[PDB]
Design a protein around this nucleic acid. Structure first.
Ligand SMILES: [Mg+2]
Length: 670
DNA sequence: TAGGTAGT
């Protein structure tokens, strides 16, 4: 009991009763996402919505609406009620431009060379014991310090080249807008923007003059793609992707971002005290501690054996063998090539010894296992990092028919691994600089796991059988494909990576049917769990009841959201809890402060029976056990959904869909 | 080339 439970602070703060609406008002369009007024849309022939206040004149902008009914907040469903409290706070109390001025005062900016780093507030609203809590969090944005108008050297013809690039409006660093149009100067429109900074953002006239300087009224007026309002380059700043930054700058900026969960909690509590709408103390929540379940490998004599971590999996010098080897690859000698960077060709003698030792040790396992061996006699080849197509130009000219492997030794890519696969060649690249500095073979061991997962080998499985016959990871996103499912068995072992062809938007009922009809996987009289990032439409509900009755299967679905607003004020890991019907899942440890996973909308369809399930200790354990099924060298999100995400991203990167290998669970796309 | 770290 003592070792099983821990109480920790979460980023939830009770909203004061003065700011909670007692009545909601229903309306419908008598004459798009009208989120501006803080509503909740329920579509029909004429769209219908709810507001956290009454619109006395049934019109505002000109859209003419019609009154339906009035209901008390306590009577409406918590999910909607929470969204209406946020809307009331956003639209009536204007929390958004207030949270902006609070953060600037707490989290000041950070300047490194030409770039500046700001912070912005994220917020959600959650219902607990009849009260409402504000989930308050903060993130960061990096922009060009020097504003757009001065950046283009006050030249309109130059500014026109920036059309289609991402910018931020200085007082609002959260929203990254896209420039679309650049037109003639309007001093009236500049005074409109200037008044907005004083009226909405509440900035003093001195603050306008301090940050923007002497306002140029002869400035061009520009328009963005995402909103119909005018923009002026003196008030805007260029934004970019974090990865696009020069390594030298990224390392320097790090210090400002990198904060421990406890240290970050201190800033949220600092921000919470200033916000007049909520209470100053964060919410105390009871968390379960997940049991660190063992894994199952094979003994020297091929018997199942328990191992708690994969860090000892390939520490030969006690000896573990693979649990499963696919029908194709079993006891084969693979035609293997070793592609080396021409820059590091002056160190090949040492590079030969590194790979030869690794495979020489791999062979000690490979001889009494029925594992595939590796053949690289005179197959040592050279390539260039900026060379591009030259390496594959010579590779295409080869006669490879059978599945083959390639180890890529460079000097510091996704492009080469994609082009190499087109000749049925599985590849795992290596950066020599890191492999040369391998302390006690840590990388060498992590390599063997990756190359095996790539070769459909199931080395280790779970020491526990789940009640589900199938755990399916689903993701929906150039090949007439719109998504895929990754199917795992009862022991957490990969079975299939199955792409889904669109008939058109891809939904769950169609996916279940495609799997039965076109994918040849038995989904009748079984216990299926679907893990997805998205949410099921109310219209899909009656259709899901139908399919589950017909198949006679227990079909479940749970939403697993990596990007959420929660944060736990602990350095601890392997913990889980529920707040406002949401699973706060924190499986992993991070040397630079972790972020929880949100778990919601757990539905069940048992032979024509829709039922809503509350987030258990059971599934949270199950979902944790799945984060341990890491074949690529644990995971934040469960393995089924993680590998589905990876496959969908590969499709966008124009990767070959080799069905034969996908059918046997070869993770070549990783 | 490992993992995680739409109001101007
Ligand atoms: Mg890899």
């Amino acid at each position: 009991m003592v070792l099983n439970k821990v109480t920790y602070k979460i980023n939830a703060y009770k909203i004061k009763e003065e700011f909670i609406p007692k009545e909601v008002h229903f309306y419908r369009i008598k004459s798009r996402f009208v989120n501006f007024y803080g509503g909740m849309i329920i579509n029909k022939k004429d769209k219908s919505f709810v507001l956290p206040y009454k619109v006395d004149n049934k019109v505002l902008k000109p859209i003419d609406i019609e009154y339906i009914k009035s209901l008390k907040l306590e009577y409406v469903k918590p999910e909607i009620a929470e969204k209406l409290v946020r809307g009331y706070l956003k639209s009536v109390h204007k929390i958004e431009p207030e949270l902006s001025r609070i953060i600037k005062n707490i989290r000041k900016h950070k300047v490194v060379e030409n770039i500046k780093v700001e912070s912005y507030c994220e917020y959600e609203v959650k219902k607990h014991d009849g009260d409402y809590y504000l989930i308050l969090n903060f993130r960061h944005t990096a922009s060009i310090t020097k504003h757009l108008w001065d950046f283009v050297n006050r030249d309109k013809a130059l500014l026109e080249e920036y059309v289609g690039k991402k910018i931020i409006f200085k007082p609002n660093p959260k929203v990254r807008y896209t420039i679309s149009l650049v037109d003639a100067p309007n001093p009236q429109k500049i005074e409109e923007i200037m008044s907005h900074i004083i009226k909405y953002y509440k900035w003093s006239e001195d603050m306008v003059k301090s940050t923007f300087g002497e306002i140029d009224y002869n400035q061009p007026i520009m328009y963005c793609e995402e909103i119909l309002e005018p923009f002026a380059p003196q008030f805007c700043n260029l934004v970019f992707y974090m990865d696009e930054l020069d390594s030298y700058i990224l390392k320097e900026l790090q210090s400002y971002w990198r904060l421990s969960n406890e240290n970050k909690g201190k800033i949220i509590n600092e921000i919470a005290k200033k916000l007049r709408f909520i209470d100053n103390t964060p919410k105390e929540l009871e968390f379960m501690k997940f049991n660190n379940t063992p894994l199952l490998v094979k003994d020297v004599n091929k018997n199942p054996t328990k191992i708690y971590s994969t860090n000892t999996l390939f520490t030969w010098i006690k000896i573990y063998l693979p649990y499963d080897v696919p029908e194709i690859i079993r006891n084969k000698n693979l035609l293997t090539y070793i592609l080396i960077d021409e820059e590091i060709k002056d160190e090949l003698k040492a590079i030969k010894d590194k790979v030869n030792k690794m495979f020489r040790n791999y062979n000690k396992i490979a001889n009494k296992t029925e594992l595939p061996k590796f053949n690289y006699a005179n197959r040592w080849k050279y390539f260039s990092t900026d060379d591009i197509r030259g390496i594959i130009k010579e590779i295409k000219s080869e006669f490879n028919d059978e599945i083959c492997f390639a180890l890529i030794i460079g000097k510091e890519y996704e492009i080469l691994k994609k082009q190499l696969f087109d000749l049925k060649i599985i590849s795992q690249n290596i950066l020599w600089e890191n492999w040369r500095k391998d302390d006690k073979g840590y990388m060498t061991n992590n390599l063997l796991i990756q190359i095996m997962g790539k070769l459909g080998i199931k080395y280790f499985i779970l020491d526990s059988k789940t009640p589900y016959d199938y755990i399916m990871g689903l993701d929906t996103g150039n090949h007439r494909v719109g998504g895929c499912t990754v199917v795992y068995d009862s022991e957490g072992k990969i079975r299939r990576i199955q792409p889904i062809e669109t008939p058109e938007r891809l939904h769950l009922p169609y996916v279940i049917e495609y799997l039965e009809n076109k994918a040849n996987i038995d989904m009748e009289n079984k216990n299926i769990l679907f893990l997805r990032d998205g949410f099921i439409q109310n219209s899909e509900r009656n259709d899901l009841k139908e399919i589950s009755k017909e198949l006679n299967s227990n079909i479940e679905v749970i939403s697993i959201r990596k990007n959420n607003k929660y944060k736990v004020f602990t350095s601890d890991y392997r913990i889980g809890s529920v707040f406002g019907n949401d699973g706060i899942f924190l499986p992993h440890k991070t040397p630079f402060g972790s972020n929880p996973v949100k778990l919601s909308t757990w539905l069940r369809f048992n032979c024509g029976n829709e039922e809503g399930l509350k987030i258990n200790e059971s599934i949270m354990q199950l979902l944790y056990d799945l984060t341990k099924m890491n074949y690529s060298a644990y995971l934040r999100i469960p393995a089924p959904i993680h590998y589905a995400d990876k496959f969908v991203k590969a499709l966008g990167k124009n990767w070959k869909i080799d069905e034969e290998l996908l059918k046997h669970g070869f993770l070549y796309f990783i």
